[PDB]
Design a protein around this ligand. Structure first.
Ligand SMILES: NC[C@H](Cl)[C@@H](O)c1cnc(N)[nH]1
Ligand SMILES: [Cl-]
Ligand SMILES: [Cl-]
Ligand SMILES: [Cl-]
Ligand SMILES: [Cl-]
Ligand SMILES: [K+]
Ligand SMILES: [Mg+2]
Ligand SMILES: [Mg+2]
Ligand SMILES: [Mg+2]
Ligand SMILES: [Mg+2]
Ligand SMILES: [Mg+2]
Ligand SMILES: [Mg+2]
Ligand SMILES: [Mg+2]
Ligand SMILES: [Mg+2]
Ligand SMILES: [Mg+2]
Ligand SMILES: [Mg+2]
Ligand SMILES: [Mg+2]
Ligand SMILES: [Mg+2]
Ligand SMILES: [Mg+2]
Ligand SMILES: [Mg+2]
Ligand SMILES: [Mg+2]
Ligand SMILES: [Mg+2]
Ligand SMILES: [Mg+2]
Ligand SMILES: [Mg+2]
Ligand SMILES: [Mg+2]
Ligand SMILES: [Mg+2]
Ligand SMILES: [Mg+2]
Ligand SMILES: [Mg+2]
Ligand SMILES: [Mg+2]
Ligand SMILES: [Mg+2]
Ligand SMILES: [Mg+2]
Ligand SMILES: [Mg+2]
Ligand SMILES: [Mg+2]
Ligand SMILES: [Mg+2]
Ligand SMILES: [Mg+2]
Ligand SMILES: [Mg+2]
Ligand SMILES: [Mg+2]
Ligand SMILES: [Mg+2]
Ligand SMILES: [Mg+2]
Ligand SMILES: [Mg+2]
Ligand SMILES: [Mg+2]
Ligand SMILES: [Mg+2]
Ligand SMILES: [Mg+2]
Ligand SMILES: [Mg+2]
Ligand SMILES: [Mg+2]
Ligand SMILES: [Mg+2]
Ligand SMILES: [Mg+2]
Ligand SMILES: [Mg+2]
Ligand SMILES: [Mg+2]
Ligand SMILES: [Mg+2]
Ligand SMILES: [Mg+2]
Ligand SMILES: [Mg+2]
Ligand SMILES: [Mg+2]
Ligand SMILES: [Mg+2]
Ligand SMILES: [Mg+2]
Ligand SMILES: [Mg+2]
Ligand SMILES: [Mg+2]
Ligand SMILES: [Mg+2]
Ligand SMILES: [Mg+2]
Ligand SMILES: [Mg+2]
Ligand SMILES: [Mg+2]
Ligand SMILES: [Mg+2]
Ligand SMILES: [Mg+2]
Ligand SMILES: [Mg+2]
Ligand SMILES: [Mg+2]
Ligand SMILES: [Mg+2]
Ligand SMILES: [Mg+2]
Ligand SMILES: [Mg+2]
Ligand SMILES: [Mg+2]
Ligand SMILES: [Mg+2]
Ligand SMILES: [Mg+2]
Ligand SMILES: [Mg+2]
Ligand SMILES: [Mg+2]
Ligand SMILES: [Mg+2]
Ligand SMILES: [Mg+2]
Ligand SMILES: [Mg+2]
Ligand SMILES: [Mg+2]
Ligand code: NA
Ligand code: NA
Ligand code: NA
Ligand code: NA
Ligand code: NA
Ligand code: NA
Ligand code: NA
Ligand code: NA
Ligand code: NA
Ligand code: NA
Ligand code: NA
Ligand code: NA
Ligand code: NA
Ligand code: NA
Ligand code: NA
Ligand code: NA
Ligand code: NA
Ligand code: NA
Ligand code: NA
Ligand code: NA
Ligand code: NA
Ligand code: NA
Ligand code: NA
Ligand code: NA
Ligand code: NA
Ligand code: NA
Ligand code: NA
Ligand code: NA
Ligand code: NA
Ligand code: NA
Ligand code: NA
Ligand code: NA
Ligand code: NA
Length: 237
RNA sequence: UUCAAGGGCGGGGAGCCAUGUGGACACGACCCGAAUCCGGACGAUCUACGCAUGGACAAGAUGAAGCGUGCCGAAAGGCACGUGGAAGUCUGUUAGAGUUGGUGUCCUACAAUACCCUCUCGUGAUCUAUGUGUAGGGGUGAAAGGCCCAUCGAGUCCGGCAACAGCUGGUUCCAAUCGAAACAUGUCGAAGCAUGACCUCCGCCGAGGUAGUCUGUGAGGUAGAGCGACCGAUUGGU
RNA sequence: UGAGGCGCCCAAAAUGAUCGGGACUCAAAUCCACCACCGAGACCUGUCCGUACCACUCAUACUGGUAAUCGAGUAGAUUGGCGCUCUAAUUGGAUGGAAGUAGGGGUGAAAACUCCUAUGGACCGAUUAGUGACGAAAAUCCUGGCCAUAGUAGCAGCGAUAGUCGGGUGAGAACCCCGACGGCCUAAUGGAUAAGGGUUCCUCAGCACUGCUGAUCAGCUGAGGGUUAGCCGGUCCUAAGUCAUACCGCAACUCGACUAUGACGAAAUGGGAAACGGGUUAAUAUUCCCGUGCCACUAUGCAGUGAAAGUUGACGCCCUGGGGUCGAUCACGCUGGGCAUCGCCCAGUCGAACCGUCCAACUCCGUGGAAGCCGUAAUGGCAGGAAGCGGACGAACGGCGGCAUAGGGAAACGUGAUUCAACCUGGGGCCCAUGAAAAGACGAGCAUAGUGUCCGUACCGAGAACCGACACAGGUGUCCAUGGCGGCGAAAGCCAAGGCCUGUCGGGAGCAACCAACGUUAGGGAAUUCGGCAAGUUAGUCCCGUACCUUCGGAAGAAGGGAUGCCUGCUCCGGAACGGAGCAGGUCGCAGUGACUCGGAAGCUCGGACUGUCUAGUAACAACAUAGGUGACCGCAAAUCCGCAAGGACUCGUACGGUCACUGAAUCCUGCCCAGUGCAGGUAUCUGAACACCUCGUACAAGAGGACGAAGGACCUGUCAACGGCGGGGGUCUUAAGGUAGCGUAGUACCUUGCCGCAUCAGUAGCGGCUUGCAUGAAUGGAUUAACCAGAGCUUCACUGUCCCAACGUUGGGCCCGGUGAACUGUACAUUCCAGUGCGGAGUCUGGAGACACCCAGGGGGAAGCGAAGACCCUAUGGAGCUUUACUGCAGGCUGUCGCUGAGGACUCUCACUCCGGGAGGAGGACACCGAUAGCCGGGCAGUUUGACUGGGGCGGUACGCGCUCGAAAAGAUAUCGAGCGCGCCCUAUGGCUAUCUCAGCCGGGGACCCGGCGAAGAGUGCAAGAGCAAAAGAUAGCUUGACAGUGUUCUUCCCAACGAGGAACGCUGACGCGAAAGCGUGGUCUAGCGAACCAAUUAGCCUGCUUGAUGCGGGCAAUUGAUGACAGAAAAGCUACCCUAGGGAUAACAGAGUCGUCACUCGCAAGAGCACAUAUCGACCGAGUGGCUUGCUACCUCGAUGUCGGUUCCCUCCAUCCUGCCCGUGCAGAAGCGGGCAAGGGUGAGGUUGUUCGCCUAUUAAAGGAGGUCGUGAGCUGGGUUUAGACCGUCGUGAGACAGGUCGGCUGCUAUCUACUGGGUGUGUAGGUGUCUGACAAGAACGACCGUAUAGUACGAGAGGAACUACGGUUGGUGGCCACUGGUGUACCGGUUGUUCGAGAGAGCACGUGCCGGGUAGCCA
């Protein structure tokens, strides 16, 4: 047979890459010596081509000009602060330790100082639940309880652009334009619509998969397709 | 080998070398003949998909939201007219792109995919130039096994290479003698082999031989016949 | 009355009859005898040759002899010889002419040798012994040359049909030049360029080459010449991205990812310092020249201390206002031209870069002070301050002044305006889409001077300069989109400017047939056809008006109805237009969107929701995509994926993510099943590898066992919007459940043209209903559904040459002439036709018939025409792509163990190692990673296998190893998918010996038992069948283990006749059993019951292992057991319609051929019925046949191809006759029939469903017969069906994929050499002429059929009803001819009229070969 589409992807050819050269900024938390004296003013609100959501242009006291993962409720003129003794309001960034429980937070770090990893897409937010000297339980948007280092910095508020998924693309053209700004090959041809040579589900005189769709985790690339290690399938039960 | 017996192999000196020649096996193996498989290279001037930077789309039609004015109403709002100018929107040989029917013309062509009429799209998932990326069990693919320079169910070039075939074709001077087998046994064997039958040639042996007939001593159950002779069929009558 | 001979009836086939033909009758037939002849290479005979043998001989040299008992031959074995090359030895020829070549003479059976003449002009032989790239008719053989083809095809076809008359030059002119007339091109056939080409550019001189003809011309040939830059490009900058170096990897590199650095990366078309005007050359030109201007740098001088913040470069899509130049147009003036019925029409009326100046818009400031005003095309603005007023900043490639008594013009050398490309400047809207960067510039003055190198620059830029082998009808980017009329228009049509007559061969025929494009056709109007394919109809604009349905958008231009020009005078909107909307009156035509441009409309059903995608080159579709729905994986040191590694994509991303899949808009919905399979989770117990550990073993080791036990598995649970399933039976069973909503004869329904209805004259169609559904059904998605569609089917109106049924015309060919000039094809011969024969499909064989030769044109009957080593089918121990629970392996994932790896069966720590963090430092941490190994999963990938037999192959079967009877032809041998049927064991006795004994069955006496008799065998003997057996081979009893060990002979296996294992018969040696003994026992009475090498285990003795001894553990001689049943032994599954190759007519489909069971038809007998009556009519059983249409069988012909079914068109035939003519019978009154005979002249038609043939149906008819010609007819047509590649549905399958199921789409090559015929000529023969005839023969259907009237309301008949002979009139079909008449044509002609151009008028051109409309002569036609 020939290599399946999932294998072509790995090669990182043009068709599969993201238009990085068009992307604006690698939104990461600032590196403050300590103290927390660092603050800045929201100079503008831009569209982030990589996340289909707003990103705030900020200018810091030390001259530094950098874009940022803007949560909802931030506008031009607003003063944002970053540091251990930063104020407890939307747009400000401080370790989960200095953050009062029950307060929605976004752009949470995994390892303190990594710049933020969790909850960064439109509308989402984590949820600081439990405190400690060692751990700070945070409920990620997927609903998982993530035990974290209290030193992990995070931003107060829900990520801006909420509700994006509510309106349907309606037409292929709209999907086309979105897809064109991501690292994804689109449209999608169904495996069952290909030839035996092209995909494990290909072939036949009619369209249906050969074997059952649920594939073992141990399956090799070229075969791992369909329902990957499904714990169950369907809706009933 | 063997208590034993019986068997196997060997034994009363002919070889070695050379030259010519018959035949066998390995090798290209009398010659040509095809689809492969493998290696290293050369191709994205075609084309597929992506990217960068540019360019293109007469004219008309329909008239979304929003806004306005007016009437009605306590309000909510509603109705009318106007404004507005949305759309993978419509008409359109604008440019440009595509390719449905004619199964027309052509079919040693104008052309190794052409001509004419017809037909579809024509502000978008649009078309297009140039630059640029992806390379061969690998790309690319809105998927047809499509496309990757007239080459694709695995490109092209050279090499491995004089690939192998039990399959088709061909294998060049004269004469004299003998003269088949198209069968048997085994065979992944039945389009092939080996071993026999049969053809030929050579050396050896040394007096018989037997294609015909008659007679003698034997073998035999086919034709025919018959079945109160077995066997099994198969009519009727007192 | 019996028998015999010969004949007769029975007796039907397709191009032209036959005994080979003629033809034959007291035979030239037949039968019985006879006589004589002809007739082979046989037989006889003369001579010769070869071969064999004999005598003589050294001899195979001579000579003599023998052959009645020698003389054919494919494959093949054997042997003597001819010829070629070069070597050697011996020996010769040649300039007094070698070799070769051409023609000719002689020898040899022959290969071949040799001579003569001519040519040639320098080499050439012989004998012997050697040598070898040593002998050709063939291979779709190779290379070269050449003939026919043939003076043939092409040099016509394209919406660009282009020329003509004069003249010039010249040896020569249709096409080279000049003038005129006439045309063509308008986003191109014009102008400027990119790539690419590369000198093609210009000049001179030429024509051997090239140029579709010619050429004096040329992109050709030769020689010269030609490209000038500070201000156009490059150059510089950076883009997607590329490379180089370092680092790292790799066995290694010219390899490889990341991270650094550097460099590269844009000539039309990214960014960017600066040039305009005129002039000039044969050829350059923002480059040269004249004039004027500008930029950068540097130097000097003055100014300036500012100088880096910021601005710029610098940016998406849609709508839109304002500013505004060119252009165009309008008014008017001037200059020049044109026209001449008028007073119109055309051209010009010029003038840059640059310098200076002006400024709308936006932004802002002051003033002011709106509580409702301001403002816009629109949105909008405001007490947070609206209008107004003043002001700051601030635009054009624009205005204005200079530039400029510069330039340019023959001259005048204008002025206003409107609409306004360019250019400038604003406002609004959209994004699940956010629309480069860097260099540079600005910021930041002025004078004067100096410098400004290097590379490109010609020309083409395309129906001749590029790519496509070509001067190729193809392909190929940019700018000119503002030239006039027209009109909505960058549309058509017409015309400027500019270009061209080079989409480059001509001349001639009223110019025939035929073909390509096309115009028009009366009446009818889809009757055509698979199907309205093709064509046609409709059309522009305004007014009125508009259904079902609908997702409320749409449907919709629904449909339907009306209007439409010109002229005169006006109104309204607007600032106005040379803008738009209307009014009144007048008025012409057949026609006013007058041409051109320019929808045909309506309805039902199927499918996919829609726009979109696709098989470059037969599929555009229902297929892919899509939004939408759904499930799965993953918290990022992730899931998924790429790399060998170093590393990488996703990712400048983070669950509202992105990966992996299914379904495929909206709406209503989406049932039941977890047994199998998959995936996932759990798990007491069971199973589960290696290391380590324990035991045995070994002075060690191999090795054997044990304990512990991971993932995995067993087991359990979860899960179907996972793969998939949703029946049989009865009022449960397989295997989990047992089909719910819906839909249903479906693109799924075999039966099937289902039934009913609608519709039609008629409807395998279509729609609706029913529906038991061969074999519908829910995200393998079910149902429904508006809109959409080059998608499939059907209906109606309209339309029409699709048809009835064809005609005429137009243009280009075609035909003739000049010039140019191929190809395909060719074993040979060839004037054939009818029959026959033959490998069964002959121009060539056989018999006849016909046939004088050559040539022109034609349409293609035949050469199983030409073209392609058949795609179909089978075969090959062929190939490839694909699949899987085929075989074997390889990646990869999971898991244990070892190493890295450290301190203190569960736990702490830090110090390696990893990651985060700039770092301090944090997280993690002996784990992870990495290296190694083990177990599991593992078509992700690789190599392969997947047998043979066979009335082809497959399915089935096994005639694949064995035994018996028969087949089998009285020895032996003997085939078939031949007939009957068996064996793959069983038995410790069912073996062995001995003793005693005789059985089946029947009878008689007291189905057990006892007694007698008859009883050669029918019993019994393990199991087929055949055979053997009676004091036994059977029965009973007793005893016994010979079913023993060893080694042979012979036969068999395998006749003859080689071959293994196996088997048997018969010995010997040893040991035994039984018997008095002879003797019997080498298993079972005989013929079936069986298996090699390698390896293991097993039995007993011995041989043996590398200097040597001991021990362990090995190697071996002999034999037993373990299986290969495909049974003389491989370890082994499938699909291909995506296919590929080698071959086969060794083998299937189609056609032919044989057969004829089948089928069609007939006959013999005649039961029976027909009210009686076999035979008017019907007709069984049985029996005998004919045909070659069906079907089947066979495997002869072709696989280096004989093109399919159906249809069509055109021709001939058969008769078994449907009609028509003439007859016979009748259950014949008549009329109408029924049955039969002769008879093939003619006729046998039109339509509805269906691809159909067939068949069903309708209405007409005299009747609407059947069949043959390769199931006649594809070098004739068509292409609906079968049967390629795409796709769907049902069924089947794990799957690829399949189907003798359905469905949508899906290509039709060739220039005719021969032959054949239709027609036309030229010659020869008969043997200079003119005119007229004859008639051997040949062709015809030239005529076939019907209706009507009189006969006649007659004959006949109760009546109803109702004939004929004959005579007439017409119709239909066929045929031949003709055009007065009717009709068509009529691009002859005349008129009307639209647009445009020539100024108007007059008169004309174009609008495709007439713009359109109306009329239409001749001719040709129906
Ligand atoms: N294939 C098995 C062989 Cl032929 C075996 O039977 C045998 C017999 N003789 C042999 N030499 N080999
Ligand atoms: Cl998305
Ligand atoms: Cl000889
Ligand atoms: Cl240039
Ligand atoms: Cl505005
Ligand atoms: K064939
Ligand atoms: Mg990031
Ligand atoms: Mg992309
Ligand atoms: Mg899809
Ligand atoms: Mg497919
Ligand atoms: Mg596969
Ligand atoms: Mg499907
Ligand atoms: Mg499916
Ligand atoms: Mg390219
Ligand atoms: Mg409007
Ligand atoms: Mg559109
Ligand atoms: Mg259109
Ligand atoms: Mg490109
Ligand atoms: Mg396919
Ligand atoms: Mg010979
Ligand atoms: Mg001889
Ligand atoms: Mg007999
Ligand atoms: Mg002979
Ligand atoms: Mg000599
Ligand atoms: Mg030969
Ligand atoms: Mg010819
Ligand atoms: Mg013309
Ligand atoms: Mg030159
Ligand atoms: Mg020239
Ligand atoms: Mg000249
Ligand atoms: Mg550069
Ligand atoms: Mg540029
Ligand atoms: Mg020039
Ligand atoms: Mg030039
Ligand atoms: Mg030309
Ligand atoms: Mg007509
Ligand atoms: Mg019809
Ligand atoms: Mg018909
Ligand atoms: Mg049509
Ligand atoms: Mg007005
Ligand atoms: Mg249907
Ligand atoms: Mg569609
Ligand atoms: Mg195609
Ligand atoms: Mg299409
Ligand atoms: Mg097509
Ligand atoms: Mg689909
Ligand atoms: Mg989806
Ligand atoms: Mg989805
Ligand atoms: Mg029906
Ligand atoms: Mg379901
Ligand atoms: Mg072949
Ligand atoms: Mg096949
Ligand atoms: Mg294969
Ligand atoms: Mg790191
Ligand atoms: Mg495989
Ligand atoms: Mg191999
Ligand atoms: Mg076979
Ligand atoms: Mg015998
Ligand atoms: Mg015996
Ligand atoms: Mg073995
Ligand atoms: Mg054993
Ligand atoms: Mg065998
Ligand atoms: Mg055998
Ligand atoms: Mg083949
Ligand atoms: Mg045959
Ligand atoms: Mg033929
Ligand atoms: Mg007759
Ligand atoms: Mg006749
Ligand atoms: Mg036929
Ligand atoms: Mg016929
Ligand atoms: Mg034919
Ligand atoms: Mg044909
Ligand atoms: Mg032809
Ligand atoms: Mg067809
Ligand atoms: Mg069809
Ligand atoms: Mg079809
Ligand atoms: Mg004309
Ligand atoms: Na499939
Ligand atoms: Na191979
Ligand atoms: Na390319
Ligand atoms: Na509105
Ligand atoms: Na076309
Ligand atoms: Na390859
Ligand atoms: Na090779
Ligand atoms: Na081979
Ligand atoms: Na044979
Ligand atoms: Na054989
Ligand atoms: Na063979
Ligand atoms: Na004798
Ligand atoms: Na007999
Ligand atoms: Na011979
Ligand atoms: Na105009
Ligand atoms: Na010419
Ligand atoms: Na569209
Ligand atoms: Na289950
Ligand atoms: Na299950
Ligand atoms: Na089902
Ligand atoms: Na479409
Ligand atoms: Na016509
Ligand atoms: Na012909
Ligand atoms: Na293949
Ligand atoms: Na096999
Ligand atoms: Na034997
Ligand atoms: Na017959
Ligand atoms: Na042939
Ligand atoms: Na036909
Ligand atoms: Na007749
Ligand atoms: Na035929
Ligand atoms: Na046909
Ligand atoms: Na054809």
């Amino acid at each position: 047979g020939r290599r399946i589409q999932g294998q072509r992807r790995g090669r990182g050819t043009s068709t599969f890459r993201a238009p990085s050269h068009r992307y604006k900024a690698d939104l990461e938390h600032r590196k403050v010596e300590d103290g927390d004296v660092i603050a800045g003013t929201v100079v503008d609100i831009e569209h982030d081509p990589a996340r289909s959501a707003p990103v705030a242009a900020v200018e810091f006291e030390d001259g530094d000009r950098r874009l940022i993962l803007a949560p909802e409720g931030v506008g031009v003129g607003d003063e944002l602060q970053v540091g251990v003794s930063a104020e407890i309001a939307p747009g400000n960034t401080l370790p989960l330790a200095e953050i009062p429980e029950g307060v929605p937070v976004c752009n949470v770090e995994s390892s303190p100082g990594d710049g933020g990893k969790f909850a960064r897409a439109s509308g989402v937010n984590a949820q600081l639940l439990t405190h400690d000297r060692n751990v700070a339980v945070v409920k990620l948007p997927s609903g998982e309880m993530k035990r974290l280092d209290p030193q992990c910095r995070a931003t107060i508020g829900v990520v801006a652009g909420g509700g994006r998924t509510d309106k349907p693309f309606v037409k292929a053209g709209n999907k086309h334009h979105k897809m064109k700004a991501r690292g994804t090959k689109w449209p999608n041809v169904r495996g069952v619509a290909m030839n035996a040579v092209d995909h494990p589900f290909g072939g036949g005189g009619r369209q249906h998969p050969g074997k059952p769709k649920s594939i073992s985790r141990n399956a090799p690339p070229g075969r791992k397709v369909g329902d990957i290690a499904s714990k169950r399938t369907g809706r009933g039960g």
